[PDB]
């Protein structure tokens, strides 16, 4: 089975992507990182992090790689990636962070660069794109390019389809509270086009666009253009929080959804459980794509009316990083 | 006819509840205040606002008064309220912003004090629950106690109103994601029997409950038991923002709700409009209500089924303190 | 073979709930056996349980009416407001960690002998009472101390970086700056906080000038800088960790590599005093186990004639990091 | 007298640039603006400001200017200074504010480009230097590029000029707590090569080099080489405030230094005083450069040794801007 990584764009992503394949002993190797940077500067921010802590492992760097735990990893500075030096380490599957190649047509540069197959960490269009215990049965060893689509996506899927499954989601609305990334502005100033972007991003709650409800249907066809939803960006480091308002295909109550909830979280690696009283920085770290909170279940009834909202917790950074080292250890054996 | 104001709690609500009525020039008299405290610290806390800033007039304090824009005004330091000496100066109408009378029964007690009509700054149970510009017109002559409700309610209730005139509400959600206040807690620690609400406040995403939803109908009385929803309190110092998700009467498009809100917040001093890309800090400072953001109107639809979710702006500050007055000056006047 | 105390926590607040983790963390020989707050065990345990600084508690936690049940083992859960009322007998605690706030004095914190409890160790300035750094004057505690005070997080980190200069080229003269961490003294909302003006400010919201003995009091610790050092802070917008700057006449002329390696030296098989040379910041101290981390990088000399100010710069993560001392001087304060 | 302004560069000190211009109604017309973006973004950030609320004027857009308090302004968008069109309107004195032209031979381009002067808002080397009310008598009609250093000199220099003409300054050491700019980076990631400037600005306590002192003999002669100091960098959105550690030509105390500085502080516009216990937030929108603060003053005495720590407040933006305009306005008719 394929076993050799390189990662493009080694920022909040793509350092958690080696910190998690190290945390779990995984057999694939990081043999090539590409950034815009030095070794040095890579080093310092793999060592020292705002919202994990101190690296787990030793972290040393030369002029042209780092040394992590004893282990050399290739250091390149290609911004664009068809010129990445890939095939001098063997690097096989890209895991590709930069968010600047978010389409089959950019990511397969990396295949013109010597890779042979992309996984990207963000949404990208149409192509197969996997949430992990969810539709990564759809997986196949034709797959070159895969997406895991958003932290966002990895949050709502599992939800909407324990809900699917159990009583049908006939038209739902999501809004998810999201702590902000760097896309995002530290003070106000021009972020591209989008105006709410451009403001400071720990001093508002900022209304933001998400692909996450809209494209479902790459991951539950059944709900293709069934749902739509937006994002409030809030001063929160790492931890989000999505709720999703759907009508059902079944009258229900609090409890029965609940249990529905809870055996669709049994024994399940990705989508976890809570009926504490939590917030978010306590998801910070988490191992789950999402977990679902039984405490904020809702359903809100006039006769046959009904509108049900559910919620559930994601770590934006880590816990989606779970699913895609998941994705990405089974893409590798196909 | 009654000019002569008492105020019980001069806290983020009671002193910026002075600010207004000075700044809106108000033949209102605050004559006496109560809190826990000395006129010093009361003094220094009216001076400087991390909100809003330098006060805009004179501040001074003696050992049992402050003197406001040369103004005396009296200081009281009584916990029970019946306790309080309110017929000294002659208040005569108590604002109530401590949190702990929000109830026909505790509020009763400023009337024994001597007083003659009580306005609760906080939801107060099932008594007479005002959003000015929505059923100011039920304060009567023969009312004493009176609640204004909360900044969520007098944020949701015109968009509400608007609807529901306009289409129709047949059942719906909400959601606000609301700036953190003084009932939470700044580092880890009890905080009564809410646990969520024991959490630091300015570090987390933290759901709690409101009843601004649920007893809409005081308000609203159509719409009565038609709605629920809850909070996601977040790091901002103030500055909010509401979420409903409706099933409304009728089949709608996104401009059709917008015209319908613009109509409504015509010359409307309580419920203000933008379609500009605003973010939370926009708000602070507000002079309405509620401010209705036509950019984030959201219509889904999927075969005869449609939810419809609308967003709304406020100052849960001081937004909501124009409100109040708006209130007291009317209620001053029966 | 080991000694196996029994102690209470009055307190279980952000100082009080750490005690226990890291109690737990370094398999303790101690026993906790009692707590004293103000609320429920569901509350505690809550608490307990998640925390926002440093994440989920490692070991289980649930609650019964009157206890929590921590990894399996029962802490019996008090709520007397009044120390003299706490019934530290029922379960035979000895030693108190004194995390409160409340009893910051012999006389207040009488009332736990008064209680029954043999020994009383503060996790705050107490006035002038045998006062411990650890690793700086912890070998002035003897079998005779039963009340004793670990002063502030501020003189945890302030204490080995000033013992350090001061043993090398001597302090003549010294003031200090703490840009601090704000904590539970201070105000989430703009509102009355006793008398401190300051103190009364949004604490996430405003840098707030903060009044600290950590300088005033230092020879508590360090006799012969008694009078010499003053200093304050400034209370911003993190939620722990910490940073000391000291700005010091010196008595000796000096450079900036000879007072870092004077500091390295002085931090080499020291369990309670790190250093670095890295440009780490504020949340790189978070769950640090020393109790300060002196930063080479920050150091600075200047110098005019035969005048010269040294500033020399110490991290601390003012929870986690004061609490592993706390826990140190109480390891040595129980076997006496 | 020159009265034509162009702004290069329309960040947080731009944008406050032209609204204390309007402020205090000079007779200085900003003809043009430079920056990388469109009219619509400029002016969306223009109206919107997180720091200081909505814009006092009327601000609109057309597809080439923006429209502000009814007059026209053009927008440009030259990446390089050479570039820019500034002989279209008549520029006569360009406010350099982009960072990127801190140097007399870098900010040289836009006198190439038909500019007559530039005023750089940053350390620009050694060129003359001028905090408004300490060295503005040094300007004369033959200067073409100056600067008006950084907002931490116009706070430590009228400080340091006070104590100096007082009592002497022998040797001093600096350390401000700022307020985070838009140098830091919102989320950890590569920031050039300063490692400490890669994290989190809102998260984290970071040190931060300035030569704010290191420099202060281009303002203060006498003082040439007898300062040092840095910054930490703070999660506070503006408002900063520096203290000095200096020893003294003699012996003082507490009450003397403060009469000292009340006496410099006298019918002074650049230079305030406080004796109230105020925190940063209480600085926003200071029409000062620096506010002395008498209730941090400390005096630490071993007989012949003396420390002596004074401290100031400066909102970093608003305020050293009025510094900026005052400079300005002088420039503009020698
Ligand atoms: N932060 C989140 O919550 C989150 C969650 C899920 C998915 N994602 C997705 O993951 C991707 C990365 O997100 P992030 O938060 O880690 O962003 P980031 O800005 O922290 O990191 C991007 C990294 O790529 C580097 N880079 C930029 N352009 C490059 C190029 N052309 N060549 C090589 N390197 C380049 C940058 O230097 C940086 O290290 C994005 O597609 C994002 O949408 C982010
Ligand atoms: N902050 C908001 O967003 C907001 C908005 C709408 C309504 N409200 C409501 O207004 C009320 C006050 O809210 P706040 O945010 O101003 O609270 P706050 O904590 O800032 O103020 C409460 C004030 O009351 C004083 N106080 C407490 N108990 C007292 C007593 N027994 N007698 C006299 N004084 C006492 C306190 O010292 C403080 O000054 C509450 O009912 C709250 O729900 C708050
Ligand atoms: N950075 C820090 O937080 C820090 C560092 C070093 C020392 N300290 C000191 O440690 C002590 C506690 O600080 P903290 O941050 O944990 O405070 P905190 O408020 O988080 O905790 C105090 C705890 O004491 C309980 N309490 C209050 N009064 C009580 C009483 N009369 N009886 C029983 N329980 C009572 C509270 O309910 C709370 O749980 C203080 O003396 C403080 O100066 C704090
Ligand atoms: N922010 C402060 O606290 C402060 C205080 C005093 C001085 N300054 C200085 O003033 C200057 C501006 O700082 P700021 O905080 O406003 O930064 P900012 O980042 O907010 O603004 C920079 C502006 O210049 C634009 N820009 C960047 N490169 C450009 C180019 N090549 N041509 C045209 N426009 C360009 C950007 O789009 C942006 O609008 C800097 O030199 C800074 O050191 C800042």
Request: charged share 20%; glycine share 8%; net charge neutral.
């Given at each position: 089975?394929?076993?050799?990584?390189?990662?493009?764009?080694?920022?909040?992503?793509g350092?958690?992507?080696?910190?998690?394949?190290?945390?779990?002993?995984?057999?694939?190797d990081?043999?090539?990182?590409?950034?815009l940077?030095?070794?040095?500067?890579?080093?310092?921010?793999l060592?020292?992090?705002?919202?994990y802590?101190?690296?787990?492992?030793?972290?040393?760097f030369?002029?042209?790689?780092?040394?992590?735990?004893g282990?050399?990893?290739?250091?390149?500075?290609?911004?664009?990636?068809?010129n990445?030096?890939?095939?001098?380490?063997?690097?096989?599957?890209?895991?590709?962070?930069?968010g600047?190649?978010?389409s089959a047509?950019?990511?397969?540069?990396?295949?013109?660069?010597?890779?042979?197959?992309?996984?990207?960490?963000?949404?990208?269009?149409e192509m197969?794109?996997?949430?992990?215990?969810?539709?990564?049965?759809?997986?196949?060893?034709?797959?070159?390019?895969?997406?895991?689509?958003?932290?966002?996506?990895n949050?709502?899927?599992?939800?909407?389809?324990?809900?699917?499954?159990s009583?049908?989601?006939?038209?739902?609305?999501?809004?998810?509270?999201?702590?902000?990334?760097g896309?995002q502005?530290?003070?106000?100033?021009?972020?591209?086009?989008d105006?709410?972007?451009?403001?400071?991003?720990?001093?508002?709650?900022?209304?933001?666009?998400?692909?996450?409800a809209?494209?479902?249907?790459?991951?539950?066809?059944?709900?293709?253009?069934?749902?739509?939803?937006?994002?409030?960006?809030?001063?929160?480091?790492?931890?989000?929080?999505?709720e999703?308002?759907?009508?059902?295909?079944?009258?229900?109550?609090?409890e029965?959804?609940?249990?529905?909830?809870?055996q669709?979280?049994?024994?399940?690696?990705?989508?976890?459980?809570?009926?504490?009283?939590?917030?978010?920085?306590?998801?910070?770290?988490?191992h789950?794509?999402?977990?679902?909170?039984?405490?904020?279940?809702?359903?809100?009834?006039?006769?046959?009316?009904?509108?049900?909202?559910?919620?559930?917790?994601?770590?934006?950074?880590?816990?989606?990083?779970?699913?895609?080292?998941?994705?990405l250890?089974?893409?590798?054996?196909?």
């Open positions: 089975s394929m076993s050799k990584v390189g990662i493009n764009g080694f920022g909040r992503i350092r958690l992507v080696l910190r998690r394949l190290l945390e779990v002993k995984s057999n694939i990081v043999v090539a990182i590409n950034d940077t030095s070794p040095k500067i890579l080093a310092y921010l060592k020292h992090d705002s919202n802590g101190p690296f787990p492992w030793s972290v040393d030369t002029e042209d790689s780092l040394i992590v735990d282990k050399s990893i290739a250091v390149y500075a290609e911004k664009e990636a068809k990445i030096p890939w095939k001098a380490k063997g690097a096989e599957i890209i895991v590709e962070c930069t600047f190649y978010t047509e950019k990511s397969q540069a990396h295949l013109d660069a010597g890779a042979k197959k992309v996984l990207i960490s963000a949404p990208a269009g197969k794109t996997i949430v992990y215990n969810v539709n990564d049965d759809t997986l196949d060893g034709n797959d070159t390019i895969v997406s895991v689509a958003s932290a966002t996506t949050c709502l899927a599992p939800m909407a389809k324990a809900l699917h499954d009583f049908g989601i006939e038209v739902g609305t999501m809004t998810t509270i999201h702590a902000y990334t896309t502005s530290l003070v106000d100033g021009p972020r591209g086009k105006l709410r972007a451009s403001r400071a991003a720990a001093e508002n709650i900022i209304p933001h666009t998400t692909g996450a809209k494209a479902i249907g790459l991951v539950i066809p059944e709900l293709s253009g069934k749902l739509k939803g937006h994002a409030q960006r809030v001063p929160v480091k790492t931890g989000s929080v999505t999703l308002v759907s009508i059902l295909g079944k009258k229900v109550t609090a029965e959804v609940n249990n529905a909830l809870k669709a979280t049994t024994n399940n690696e990705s989508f976890g459980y809570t009926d504490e009283e939590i917030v978010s920085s306590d998801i910070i770290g988490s789950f794509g999402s977990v679902f909170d039984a405490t904020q279940t809702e359903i809100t009834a006039v006769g046959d009316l009904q509108l049900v909202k559910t919620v559930a917790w994601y770590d934006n950074e880590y816990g989606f990083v779970t699913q895609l080292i998941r994705t250890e089974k893409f590798a054996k196909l």
